[PDB]
Amino acid sequence: DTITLPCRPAPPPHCSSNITGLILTRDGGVSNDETEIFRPSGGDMRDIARCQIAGTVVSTQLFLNGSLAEEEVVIRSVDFRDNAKSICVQLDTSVEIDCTGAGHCDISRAKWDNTLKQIASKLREQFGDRTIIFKQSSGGDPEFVTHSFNCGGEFFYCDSTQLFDSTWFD
Numbered sequence: 232d233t234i235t236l237p238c239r240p241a242p243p244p245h246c247s248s249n250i251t252g253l254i255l256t257r258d259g260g261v262s263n264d265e266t267e268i269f270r271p272s273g274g275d276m277r278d279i280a281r282c283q284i285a286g287t288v289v290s291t292q293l294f295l296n297g298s299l300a301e302e303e304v305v306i307r308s309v310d311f312r313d314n315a316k317s318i319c320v321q322l323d324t325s326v327e328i329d330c331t332g333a334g335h336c337d338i339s340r341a342k343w344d345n346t347l348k349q350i351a352s353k354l355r356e357q358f359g360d361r362t363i364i365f366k367q368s369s370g371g372d373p374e375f376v377t378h379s380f381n382c383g384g385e386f387f388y389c390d391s392t393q394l395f396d397s398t399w400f401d
């Protein structure tokens with residue numbers, strides 16, 4: 232099985248990338264459900280220091296191409312206790328996005344799931360034994376809410392509401 236994310240306009244095949252990390256923002260679990268909600272960020276991915284892992288392509292939410300870890304998912308922040316501070320996520324293996332040109336870029340469901348199992352068990356190291364909920368960016372504009380990227384001089388905007396709709400370790 233495969234996660235089919237629609238994008239506008241129809242991304243060319245050469246815009247296939249590797250996901251090598253992502254910026255998350257805890258809202259975070261503010262007055263108790265024994266949970267933590269995390270959402271992908273809509274902010275500039277260079278407006279977050281101590282996450283100097285981006286290569287060349289301009290994006291939001293995830294890092295297309297760019298730097299990987301030595302061989303364990305590494306999650307960092309300037310202060311996890313402050314929810315205004317974004318969380319840097321750097322992978323160890325990259326999940327490939329295959330843009331076929333029709334209108335959607337595709338992700339192996341199995342690859343994502345286990346990239347999510349590792350992130351959540353890393354977040355669970357920092358914050359402890361609590362439910363890690365992955366959810367959609369909660370707005371701002373039609374830009375913010377999507378995974379946007381630059382490829383061939385143009386911006387493509389992908390409905391990323393599928394990658395972030397999970398709960399781990401209830």
Ligand SMILES: *[C@@H]1O[C@H](CO)[C@@H](O)[C@H](O)[C@H]1NC(C)=O
Pocket residue numbers: 247248249325327
């Ligand atoms: C993505 O994944 C691996 C990372 O080592 C790389 O060897 C491969 O060439 C990359 N392919 C694409 C399409 O990004």
Ligand SMILES: *[C@@H]1O[C@H](CO)[C@@H](O)[C@H](O)[C@H]1NC(C)=O
Pocket residue numbers: 245246247248249288295296380381382
């Ligand atoms: C990322 O790297 C691959 C392999 O070099 C490249 O072909 C692809 O176009 C890059 N992705 C983007 C969005 O430019």
